[PDB]
């Protein structure tokens, strides 16, 4: 009865950069940060895989 509201999804804490990382839950926030920072630096390849 004390609960008034609830988080809608489980992804609202994070951003777009971080929502693309799978198993973020099993990753240190220091390496998670670098991982999302490098995912932005990913040059698209010849054939989109």
């Amino acid at each position: 009865d004390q609960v008034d509201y609830m988080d809608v999804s489980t992804q609202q804490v994070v951003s777009v950069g971080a929502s693309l990382i799978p198993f973020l839950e099993h990753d240190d926030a220091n390496r998670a940060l670098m991982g999302a920072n490098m995912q932005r630096q990913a040059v698209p390849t010849l054939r989109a895989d």
């Binding site: 804490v13 973020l24 099993h26 240190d28 926030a29 220091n30």
Partner: protein, 1362 residues
């Protein structure tokens, strides 16, 4: 071009005219279409010279046919454009203008010389009030300011007889009239009368300025500029862009502001305009001049086009972005290339991959050279094209020159000398550099996208220097610690570990082999595992008494893998070294052993072979990272669930109102801290020996071959601390503020964090990575600060001829010996014959280096304490001797004379701090402290030996200690210190002084999260100066009503009870005081701030009861972030805000007079008849209790020790022993290894200057503070000639100040305060003769150290020979 010194003096208006080749009279830069100088403009060729090499403007005289011809029409000479940056100009100022650097650069200088304040002078300048120059009629005296009202009064009344004027004109006439000869004598006379501190300081400084000003030959009028120099136009360029735009420096713009206003003043003086306007024009003119010299200083810096401030002159000499740091000491350099580095696992140590196309461009002049020799190129543009076409036969020539040619490889940042190492380039087709794995440690080079700069040593000397000094093979051990930095890691360690490590039976257990070759035969044949115990016949080679090697053949029970590793092992080391399972820590000893025994060659080979076999067998293993490998212990959910209910219990007790918030905060940390270590150990206990399932007959227990464990146990990557997060518990993270989150992370990385568990993990992660970026500048700035002071130190003499040394003892702190005496006193020259226990025969000579083998005999004899020849005990003037320093830890034997230590020392100190502020700041993110020091348990049996202890027995029957720095020793059978502890104040001892204890007995016990105030006498408690609301507060509960009292400090205290000291006074049953046994002190314990008290007024007490409990909140992981500042403060010599008092001279203590609790002390020494009084606070407690035999510098108060207080009293070897212990304590907390001699270097430099006390044969006199070396050279001639000795007293100097003290002003301005350094050096007229490195690196000469030491001294004999 080759000189001796550089001088700085004041630019006279007449002097400025000597450099100037003309007067710029117009702001006109160039004509708009004809891009050419204008008539006597700022780019005038009639003043600054011609545009091109030998070409006049109009074009009448061209090139060298008209060598030095001056044109008629334009009036321009025909010399090189060379002169356009050499030739200067000037401007004839209508009215004189004041220099901002001799007005605003404090001290005032112009005001310090006149004995006149700032306001007074400025209000004269901006025309607010007149100033008297000289009053004939003594009515008005000199330097007396008169407002616009007061000038008019004297004009009609007195007038004429008084001369007073306004603006920069007046102050110049004041400077021009003042007599330096007379006002020097006047000040000396006033000094003889009754001199104080401030009065004598002011007088002596002015006195020296006045004498300095006369001897510098400077005149105080040059402070005001009648002439203003112009910078050469090429040094303030107006050059055109490719895009048809132009671009000009901000100087040109600032110059046009000066000339316009100056010419407008000439115009207004032609018109005889009213003075009100002339005033504005003069104020403007000064604003422009001051803005030109130093823009942002006097007022708002004149902003320009892009709303930004104009860059002035001073700005190009000022700080980082100045010429010094940016365009002189640091340079972009030719024969230089950089590229992404990648691994070079095939290379040897003395090799590195260099791309072809890189080395191609780098060695361009060496190709053209070898080409003309072969006759393939006739000329150089022919050779240029041959290279460009990249034809086949040019690759083979490039390949020829590069062989037997070293290259320098640098990685940023350059922390220590090993940040550059030289190799023999190996051309590789690819844009990547390939670097040797073992030296990756020195650079800290991770192949994750690192780039390393290449540099080619051009000169043959540079090729020899690179091969001799900077070669990777010649650089093994760190200079900081005598320890190998060239040591495998990562794969290499793991591979050897896999090899050596053994297992049960396996294939072919207990077999029997001819050699370690049959072991390779059987393993690779598929009929034996590397983990099989088999008897093998190996023949080990042991060194004898001489150089000959003895051979011994025997049956060794090892493993197949160990046997194969013996093949790599050179013959000279024992086999017992590879008989163990090898790890990183074991491997580091193999190379060190190999080095100390065989030499250099054997080690380089060994090092490489170790690396090769390491990688190869690591890859044969197939070591992996499955998720079944991250094993969580069986009973994690069992530990936590009930460790949570543990914390939930106290939470309900707190809201009830007994356990306070601070006690709960420390109490909950202890529960989690136990649970965290509980889960950590259950993990490794289930993970280390997970292999409980073996064979042979039925079973056996064995080490686990879990991939992750092997990778941690071997010491390859990660540790027990990391695995905790993976399979165990992540642990408690740290906030970005510094406080630790009460709720830690329960989950690990296998099970997966929930949404918050990650949100929580962020707080500690961001703050840990914030201190990686921001905190690094303080540590790197320390390196800079240390270096400058330690630039000059170089090994000069071979033997200083001094007896003085430094007694060192073994660092035995925290039971287990922290640092052995052998390691402490290693490679340091003795100062005293140190023999064995039985004093009847010598064993170690006085002047002899301590090799590791000589130190081994110190262990047999068990040396007590040693006087080592230290750096600070050196008598060598301008440097040190090789004996004082001892061995070069990097090399491995006695240091070369000429090697520049100071820089090596500074680097060694700043590297660890700068490296421990980024390694566990990017990979960590959580606190790991365990400050639950509840109780000392003694481990070996001994007699209890306390020292510096004053205890008292309590009601319970327990020895309670009432002294702060109590130490506890552990004395063995014969009578020597084995273990040592710190017992704190109010601790309960199990057994008192002299009593026997057994092993594993709690000898001491106390509460860590509390600092009790314990009594020495029995009776009742009285409240004194404990008024509710002013000094203390009160808070009650319910039914009965137990109230606690909390003492407020000056922060939470009103202005009413500020001088009231709150204390719990002891009284008897009658109500009178109770004297403390054997002292005239009525019992009164002063409670400090935030002191929680449970007993209220009128409560009976025995001796040993706790009156109040002072909270001890300190749960912030010091790490390196909050430990470097303390290092800096020590070096910078900043006295603490609670220094401890010490006795000056030895004699009889005699307590004296008092002032409302403020205690004095009338000490009357036995020899010294004149008493000495010093004052003491009330709340502060002393250590001595009056009437005593005190010596020089006994401890009277407790707290932090002031570095100045130590040298002032207890001499040099006391302050050196302090800093060295204090500094190392901070680095030892972090596991940073530094030899004490490196700190001793900086200490020595901090003892550079010294104040003189007593008049000498030279005009020293009192108040002067000269360098210690110069005054001692005067004492050399004094003891020979007699005359009057110059007695002294050495002073301690902070780093920042010790750098600005050195006679070299170039070294000082190159550092910081550059605006001040130059002005002080100009007024003094000082000439720098260059001794330091910074000095000769600037001028680009030979460094008076290292390679250049042999050369510089060969020039010093040119000076000596006539």
């Amino acid at each position: 071009e080759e000189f001796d010194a550089i001088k700085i003096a004041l630019a006279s208006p007449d002097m400025i005219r000597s450099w100037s080749f003309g007067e710029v009279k117009k702001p006109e830069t160039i004509n708009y279409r004809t891009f050419k100088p204008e008539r006597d403009g700022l780019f005038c060729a009639r003043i600054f010279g011609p545009v091109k090499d030998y070409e006049c403007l109009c074009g009448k005289y061209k090139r060298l046919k008209h060598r030095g011809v001056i044109c008629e029409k334009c009036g321009v000479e025909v010399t090189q454009t060379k002169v356009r940056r050499e030739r200067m100009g000037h401007i004839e100022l209508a009215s004189p203008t004041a220099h901002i650097w001799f007005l605003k650069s404090l001290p005032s200088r112009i005001g310090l010389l006149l004995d006149m304040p700032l306001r007074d002078i400025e209000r004269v300048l901006y025309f607010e009030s007149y100033v008297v120059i000289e009053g004939g009629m003594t009515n008005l005296e000199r330097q007396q300011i008169l407002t616009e009202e007061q000038y008019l009064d004297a004009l009609e009344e007195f007038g004429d007889e008084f001369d007073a004027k306004m603006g920069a004109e007046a102050i110049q006439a004041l400077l021009k009239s003042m007599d330096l000869e007379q006002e020097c004598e006047q000040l000396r006379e006033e000094l003889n009368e009754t001199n104080s501190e401030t009065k004598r300081k002011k007088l002596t400084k002015r006195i020296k300025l006045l004498e300095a000003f006369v001897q510098s030959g400077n005149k105080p009028e040059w402070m005001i500029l009648t002439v203003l120099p112009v910078l050469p136009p090429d040094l303030r360029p107006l050059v055109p862009l490719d895009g048809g735009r132009f671009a000009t420096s901000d100087l040109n713009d600032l110059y046009r502001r000066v000339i316009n206003r100056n010419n407008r003043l000439k115009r207004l003086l032609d018109l005889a305009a009213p003075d009100i306007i002339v005033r504005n024009e003069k104020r403007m003119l000064q604003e422009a001049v001051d803005a030109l010299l130093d823009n942002g200083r006097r007022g708002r810096a004149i902003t320009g086009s892009n709303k930004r401030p104009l860059k002035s002159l001073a700005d190009m000499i000022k700080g980082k972005q100045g010429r010094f740091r940016q365009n002189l000491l640091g340079k972009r350099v030719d024969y230089s290339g950089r590229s992404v580095i990648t691994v070079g696992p095939y290379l040897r140590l003395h090799q590195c991959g260099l791309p072809k196309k890189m080395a191609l461009e780098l060695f361009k002049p060496f190709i053209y050279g070898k080409l003309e020799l072969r006759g393939l190129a006739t000329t150089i543009k022919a050779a240029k094209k041959m290279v460009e076409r990249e034809e086949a036969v040019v690759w083979d020539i490039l390949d020829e020159v590069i062989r037997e040619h070293p290259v320098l490889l640098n990685r940023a940042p350059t922390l220590h000398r090993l940040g550059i190492q030289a190799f023999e380039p190996v051309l590789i087709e690819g844009k990547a550099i390939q670097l040797h794995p073992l030296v990756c440690a020195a650079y800290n080079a991770d192949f994750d996208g690192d780039q390393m700069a290449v540099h080619v040593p051009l000169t043959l000397e540079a090729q020899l220097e690179a091969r001799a000094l900077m070669m990777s093979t010649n650089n093994i051990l760190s200079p900081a610690n005598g320890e190998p930095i060239i040591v495998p890691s990562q794969d290499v360690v793991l591979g050897l570990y896999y090899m050596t490590r053994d297992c049960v039976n396996a294939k072919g257990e207990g077999m029997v082999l001819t050699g370690p070759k049959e072991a390779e035969r059987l393993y690779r044949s598929g009929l034996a595992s590397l983990h099989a115990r088999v008897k093998v016949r190996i023949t080990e080679y042991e060194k004898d008494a001489n150089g000959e090697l003895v051979a011994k053949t025997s049956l060794k029970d090892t493993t197949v893998g160990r046997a194969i590793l013996w093949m790599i092992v050179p013959k000279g080391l024992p086999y017992s070294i590879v008989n163990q399972a090898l790890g990183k820590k074991a491997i580091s000893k193999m190379l060190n052993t190999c080095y100390r025994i065989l030499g250099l060659k054997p080690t380089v080979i060994f090092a490489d072979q170790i690396m090769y076999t390491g990688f190869a067998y690591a890859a044969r293993s197939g070591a992996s990272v499955g998720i079944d490998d991250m094993v969580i212990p069986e009973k994690k959910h069992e530990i936590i669930s009930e460790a949570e209910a543990e914390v939930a219990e106290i939470q309900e007790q707190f809201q009830s109102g007994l356990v306070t918030a601070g006690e709960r905060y420390n109490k909950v940390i202890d529960i989690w801290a136990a649970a965290n270590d509980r889960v950590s150990k259950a993990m490794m206990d289930n993970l280390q020996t997970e292999t409980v399932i073996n064979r042979d007959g039925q079973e056996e227990k064995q080490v686990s071959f879990n991939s992750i464990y092997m990778m941690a146990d071997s010491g390859a990557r990660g540790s027990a601390a990391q695995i905790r997060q993976l399979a165990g518990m992540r642990g408690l993270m740290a906030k970005p503020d510094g406080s630790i989150i009460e709720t830690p992370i329960t989950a690990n990385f296998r099970e997966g964090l929930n949404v918050l568990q990650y949100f929580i993990s962020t707080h500690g992660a961001r703050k840990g990575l914030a201190d990686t970026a921001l905190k690094t500048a303080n540590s790197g700035y320390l390196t800079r600060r240390l270096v400058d002071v330690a630039q000059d130190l170089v090994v000069t003499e071979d033997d200083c001829g001094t007896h003085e040394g430094i007694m060192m003892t073994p660092v035995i702190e925290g039971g287990d010996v922290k640092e052995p005496l052998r390691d402490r006193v290693l490679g340091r020259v003795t100062a005293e014959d140190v023999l064995k226990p039985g004093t009847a025969d010598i064993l170690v000579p006085r002047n002899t280096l301590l090799h590791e083998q000589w130190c081994d005999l110190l262990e047999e004899n068990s040396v007590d304490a040693v006087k080592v020849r230290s750096v600070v005990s050196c008598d060598t003037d301008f440097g040190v001797c090789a004996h004082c320093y001892g061995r070069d830890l990097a090399r491995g034997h006695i240091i070369n004379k000429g090697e520049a230590i100071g820089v090596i020392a500074a680097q060694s100190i700043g590297e660890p701090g700068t490296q421990l502020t980024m390694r566990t700041f990017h990979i960590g993110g959580a606190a790991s402290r365990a400050a639950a020091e509840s109780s000392i348990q003694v481990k070996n049996k001994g007699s209890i030996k306390l020292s510096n202890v004053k205890s008292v027995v309590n009601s319970s029957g327990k020895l309670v200690i009432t002294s702060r720095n109590t130490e506890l020793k552990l004395i063995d059978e014969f009578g020597r210190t084995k273990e040592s502890y710190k017992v704190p104040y109010g601790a309960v001892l199990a057994k008192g002084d002299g009593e026997q204890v057994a092993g594993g007995e709690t000898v001491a016990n106390w509460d860590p999260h509390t600092m009790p105030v314990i009594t020495e006498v029995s009776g009742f408690v009285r409240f004194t100066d404990m008024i509710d609301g002013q000094t203390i507060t009160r808070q009650t509960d319910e039914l009965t009503g137990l109230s606690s009292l909390v003492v407020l400090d000056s922060a939470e205290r009103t202005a009413g009870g500020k001088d009231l000291r709150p204390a719990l006074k002891i009284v008897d049953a009658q109500g009178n005081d109770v004297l403390i046994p054997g002292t005239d002190m009525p019992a009164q314990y002063f409670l400090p701030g935030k002191a929680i008290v449970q007993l209220e007024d009128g409560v009976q007490i025995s001796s040993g009861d706790t009156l109040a409990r002072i909270p001890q909140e300190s749960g912030g992981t010091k790490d390196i972030t909050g430990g470097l500042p303390r290092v800096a403060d020590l070096f910078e010599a900043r006295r603490p805000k609670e220094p401890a008092i010490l006795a000056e001279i030895s004699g009889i203590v005699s307590f004296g007079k008092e002032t409302k609790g403020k205690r004095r002390l009338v000490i009357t020494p036995v020899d010294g008849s004149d008493p000495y009084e010093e004052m003491i606070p009330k709340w502060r407690q002393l250590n001595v209790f009056e009437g005593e035999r005190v010596e020089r510098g006994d401890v009277i108060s407790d707290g932090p020790e002031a570095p100045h207080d130590i040298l002032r009293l207890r001499g040099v070897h006391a302050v050196t022993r302090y800093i060295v212990n204090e500094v190392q304590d901070v680095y030892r907390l972090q596991g940073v290894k530094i030899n004490d001699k490196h700190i001793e270097v900086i200490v020595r430099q901090m003892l550079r200057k010294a104040t003189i006390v007593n008049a000498g044969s030279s005009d020293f006199l009192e108040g002067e503070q000269v360098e210690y070396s110069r005054v001692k050279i005067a004492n050399r001639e004094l003891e020979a000639n007699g005359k009057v000795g110059a007695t002294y007293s050495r002073d301690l100097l902070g780093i920042t100040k010790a750098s600005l003290a050195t006679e070299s002003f170039i070294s000082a301005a190159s550092f910081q305060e550059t605006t001040r350094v130059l002005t002080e050096a100009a007024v003094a007229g000082k000439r720098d003769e260059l001794r330091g490195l910074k000095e000769n690196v600037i001028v680009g000469r030979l460094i008076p150290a290292g390679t250049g030491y042999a050369y510089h001294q060969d020039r010093m004999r040119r000076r000596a020979a006539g």
